[PDB]
Amino acid sequence: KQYIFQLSSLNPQERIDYCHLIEKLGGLVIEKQCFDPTCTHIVVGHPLRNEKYLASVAAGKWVLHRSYLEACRTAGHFVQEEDYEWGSSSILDVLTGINVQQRRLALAAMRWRKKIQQRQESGIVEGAFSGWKVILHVDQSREAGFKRLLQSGGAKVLPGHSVPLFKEATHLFSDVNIAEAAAQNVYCLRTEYIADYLMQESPPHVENYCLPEAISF
């Protein structure tokens, strides 16, 4: 009903042209660079395993090829999204070539969009990390990006890593007493689990991501 777009990985002339077009068709453009969960649609020049793309997937947004906005321009209104989804057979047929990484990111975006939007049609909005209550233990340079990615998918990020937080926590991610968290029914996992959870067709085996101090639990 109200279309709200962000743009990623586009050239400058494209960005200007598409912002103009979106506004002309009655959409809103979020011009700020970080992912904003207010958006409904993201148009990306190529999939990347970065925070903005993974956050769009974790939130189940429409992740669309630029040919979507060319179809809108021709129609003079926002058209049906499905055939312009990055993971769609229609787009994968449209491309001359795609690397396995980009194909996997494209299929992940479509898989999560279908799941999250099917539930939305039934009156529940939940992201890929719904029910996660997370302790982060990462390098300061990485903390804010992990927090933004987890919150985009619906996770609650707990304030710090003190022992009282282990009771409510579901997950602790490390790049603090790990064995005590593990003893309090916290999955204590390497940070690779987050991208791999979004990307893998079936949920990753936690055993492959379990931090050393937690292997017993």
């Binding site: 700020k32 990006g145 990307m199």
Partner: peptide, 15 residues
Amino acid sequence: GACFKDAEYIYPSLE
């Protein structure tokens, strides 16, 4: 956030 800087950061994978 440092969105422009952090945008470069590729999240780790066991793949």
